[PDB]
Amino acid sequence: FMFTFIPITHPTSDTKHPLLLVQSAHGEKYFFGKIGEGSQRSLTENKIRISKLKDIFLTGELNWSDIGGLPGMILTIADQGKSNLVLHYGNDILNYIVSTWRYFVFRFGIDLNDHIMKDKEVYKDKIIAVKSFNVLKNGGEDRLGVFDSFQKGVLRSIVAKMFPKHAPTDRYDPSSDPHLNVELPDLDAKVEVSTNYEISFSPVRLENERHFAKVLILDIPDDLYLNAFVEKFKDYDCAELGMVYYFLGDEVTINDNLFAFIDIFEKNNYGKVNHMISHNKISPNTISFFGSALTTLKLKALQVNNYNLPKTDRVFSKDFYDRFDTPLSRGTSMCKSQEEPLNTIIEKDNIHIFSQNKTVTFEPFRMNEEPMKCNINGEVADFSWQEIFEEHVKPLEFPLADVDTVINNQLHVDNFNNSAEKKKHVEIITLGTGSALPSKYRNVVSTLVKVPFTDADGNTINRNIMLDAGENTLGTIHRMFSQLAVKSIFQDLKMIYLSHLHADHHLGIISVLNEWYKYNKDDETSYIYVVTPWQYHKFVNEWLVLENKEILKRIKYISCEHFINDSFVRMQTQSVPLAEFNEKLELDRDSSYRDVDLIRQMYEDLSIEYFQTCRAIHCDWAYSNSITFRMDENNEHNTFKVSYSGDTRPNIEKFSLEIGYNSDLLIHEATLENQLLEDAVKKKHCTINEAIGVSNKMNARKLILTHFSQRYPKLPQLDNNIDVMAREFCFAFDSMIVDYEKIGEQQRIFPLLNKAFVEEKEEEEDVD
Ligand SMILES: [Zn+2]
Ligand SMILES: [Zn+2]
């Protein structure tokens, strides 16, 4: 009869938002906070179990950063077999959110209910009780809301169609269903609201009854909210209030003004109240994925210059750290949000940094006899590059792999565009190299190709090209590079291509577009081309009208079917209006016409000589594609040709021999180990051989393999009986930076590479 408040994620390069798990004495579990990108992967890394959990209390404003991990989480918690699941929030917008995920989220046998809480509504459980409060950024009280009662009705119906009781038909693709092409309700009466929660606990039980402290969970996106937050909480009775949790946004600044809000909650009736601060200039930037970081470090020991080491630094808030204690050690970068020190009545032993191993436990107590029982356990997870080197990689004894050459003298060096050659010829960063589920060791797919273009005058600029981007792609980016380096990358990001509608390929695209906007915002003539299946353009539109309408004025979407190398262009479905969703559908004749104006305009802008696609043998509306880049003004013959499979079953007829043919570089899917050939054919992916076979008939001058399914990090088992028709090749690993010219210099290391992860083999074999 006790509760532990165990933090899952804190603000960090990989994990942008806080998430908190409250766990009962006998295992009843509830999430509070935000289910952002990487938040489902961080559960598996740390071996946390989600048995009994069916309640997610979503706080704050809901943009893509705050919920991009949620589609993933739902389809993972379903695949794990969870019967029910309830999403809580204080605004009807939540149903519009899940509704935007029609074409990519579908699971039967899960009872997914959305619970839209009124302003002061209580949710009583057997064990817990949870009252909500909705702060409204600018206004006071919520009147009509956002959607009318008909609009709310149809949105709930879409959610029901997404998570039905019984299986529909065995060959059912949400992509290829006409009834999901609905016109979602317009966001005109939309409101900016932070949802917060008060958590009370059920008393324990002739004798006399013991009570529990009350936890408040606040979520403040930015400063403009604070005026509304003081207006809503000034007269809030802090009687039995034991702790307040502050989920403070990036945009909120740590100044006298914030602490005038915090000061409201200085006292309770039986003593003082402890404060827990989650903020990105306060919480440390620890490594979130140690599996990945170790795997990356071992790989850097073999081929240095092809990996960056995970950064762990950030600027902290001097104002804060000085006003309490552990002031900064003078090497680490500080920030000073104001001239004067912090004006606040809070004591140092009653305020704490929200961090990963910093758990809090509440025991019950005799109301007015004794002080309220609350115990803040744990310390920040310390970490040392040198100490993990000597333990985990030094004993492997690789050629010239030592604590200096791998770590120390590499620690301050970006291996992206630095050298002479690297400027004027192609690079590929493989930011994710995995199938379906984010694993401990390989994140979901993303492939970023730098294709340079040299000018008449002879100076050379990059054309960065995104080829899919699953959950937390912008995370894995922010982690490898410094902030100074990310700006240049997004300023040169000219195109985003999606192969198909599976969630492992697109769930980071919105984050990517948000970041692209951050950097290209200010150039009125800066645009981004987005070539995707047409259903994903529905999403982008219905999402960005919610989150940032302005970005839609810079997106120049083509559509994959308008590049198909086929006389016949498949006709897309006509959008069925809102009214007529209730209980054949006409196709759109105009959708058959290639948007040739915009294609020609892409070619001129990005210097593409030819872009074309073909159909992948996988999903409906899947695609494989091939792009030919002219490399300078003063040369006709200087073309570079890239090709990228979707999740295709090997397609040697239409892709290898036709569109892909004679390509300088192929990037192909190699999901399955050869041993699982009969599973690959059902799941519609190539095996490592079937991939190499495609690369062969194509005549790929070079090859890269990605989208690996694996129980553990290994180099794939090459078949001795098959040739590599390809002057150079390599196997992708998360955060890897090849130069196109130097793709082959992995082959030299192939024998040693296999040895490197025997530690991770024996570990994952603990179940076998
Ligand atoms: Zn996939
Ligand atoms: Zn797929």
Curated annotation (Swiss-Prot):
Q: Where in the cell is it found?
A: Cytoplasm; Nucleus
State whether keyword Magnesium applies.
no
UniProt catalytic activity: Endonucleolytic cleavage of RNA, removing extra 3' nucleotides from tRNA precursor, generating 3' termini of tRNAs. A 3'-hydroxy group is left at the tRNA terminus and a 5'-phosphoryl group is left at the trailer molecule
Mention any Pfam family matching this sequence: Lactamase_B_4
Show the InterPro entries listed in the entry.
RibonucZ/Hydroxyglut_hydro, RNZ2-like, tRNase_Z_dom
Enzyme Commission identifier(s): 3.1.26.11
What Gene Ontology biological process does one annotation of this record name? tRNA 3'-end processing
Required co-factor(s) are: Zn(2+)
GO CC terms of this entry? cytoplasm; mitochondrion; nucleus
Keyword annotations from UniProtKB, A to Z: Cytoplasm, Endonuclease, Hydrolase, Metal-binding, Nuclease, Nucleus, Phosphoprotein, tRNA processing, Zinc
Molecular functions (GO terms): 3'-tRNA processing endoribonuclease activity; metal ion binding
Listed under subunit, the entry gives: Homodimer.
Family statement drawn from the similarity comment of this UniProt entry:
Belongs to the RNase Z family.
Q: What else is known?
A: Present with 2710 molecules/cell in log phase SD medium.
Q: What does this protein do?
A: Zinc phosphodiesterase, which displays some tRNA 3'-processing endonuclease activity. Probably involved in tRNA maturation, by removing a 3'-trailer from precursor tRNA.
By what name is this protein known? Ribonuclease Z
